Symmetry: D2
Subunit: 115 residues, 4 copies
């Protein structure tokens, strides 16, 4: 998959399961166009968001619904979401893994980019 998202829970030491993820692409008019969406699996992974064909060059935003995740576990967290904004495919097709590590008042995000 050219775009994969992995989410971990730093309180439980577990994959973050059933986390909603929305991907947008910046349009020529500077608005955010919906691009793809999905939910993390039992492994905390979300595959199959897009295809080589559809994932063209652009500025992408990956919005991870961390507040819905924490509220479903009965926790009141700080952030509304984790937002990951990046230019993709500027020098040709690449494969992107966007990882997020979640705590109720903190998160980390890392990109692994492969050719």
């Amino acid at each position: 998959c050219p775009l994969m998202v992995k989410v971990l829970d730093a309180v439980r030491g577990s994959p973050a399961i059933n986390v909603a993820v929305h991907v947008f692409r910046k349009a020529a008019d500077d608005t955010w166009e919906p691009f793809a969406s999905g939910k993390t699996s039992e492994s905390g992974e979300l595959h199959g968001l897009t295809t080589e064909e559809e994932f063209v060059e652009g500025i992408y935003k990956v919005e991870i619904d961390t507040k819905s995740y924490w509220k479903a576990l009965g926790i009141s967290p700080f952030h509304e979401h984790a937002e990951v904004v990046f230019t993709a495919n500027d020098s040709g097709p690449r494969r992107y893994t966007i990882a997020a590590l979640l705590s109720p008042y903190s998160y980390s995000t890392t990109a692994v980019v492969t050719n």
Copy 2:
């Protein structure tokens, strides 16, 4: 000072100096209204963004211009910016520090909320 931002550079082991920071408040129509901005100091800090009176409950977004930071150091970055989105809640402690730790392909952010 209800709202302060601290930025650290994980590659050099230093405060992240002269980083542009923009704070937005979400409007009733779901747009982002500019609210406050500035540049981190020699200590990596940005104070004086707002006042108790101005900083009402609401959804806020803090955009840290990480890409320009890494460009000025001659280092190739992944993200356009770091985005921190949160609801201000008067029920909790009154002083918010939004910390960010920057690497070229990764960042973390933490909210330190104190009285």
Copy 3:
């Protein structure tokens, strides 16, 4: 595998390849006994450190040779290693993934523990 180690490089956005890892186990005399060792692969993974049989209860230390990694890439980093110390298998056998995200002046480590 009951014990796996994954290492990422937050400067390159890549797996951290050929990273030496040493695992120790605390002996009844309080010294650190060598337990297993290995090197991360092209994927940044290290499997096959141990077996269900050998990985009994105890206090384990996973030492990741981050300074050798950075020096091989021509970089002078801050830490000597990343050290991950934990009690394992206290309530029966579990599978542990120890992840580390490396920058020259910073690192993160996460444990994913599965039954």
Copy 4:
């Protein structure tokens, strides 16, 4: 103050208060000699560990007692402690801040080295 330690709690969004911290210096025989210790303050900080005169070049280990911290909050932790091992180098900046961000199954540490 050549050596200062700052600890943050990612679950509560707060300084990590009353955390025990032990600093060791590596001896010629490869053992760890106690060097300095204390408990983080209400701000999560530990100042006054050493002096310019005492803090000579050498390999140091900072052990942060994360397990006792999480136990006192009634939260189940993974790590025994957080370990930060580094060489002090007079060629670089003179003030070292060792920051740590704590979650139950994850931590990060960063060195902020300034003049």
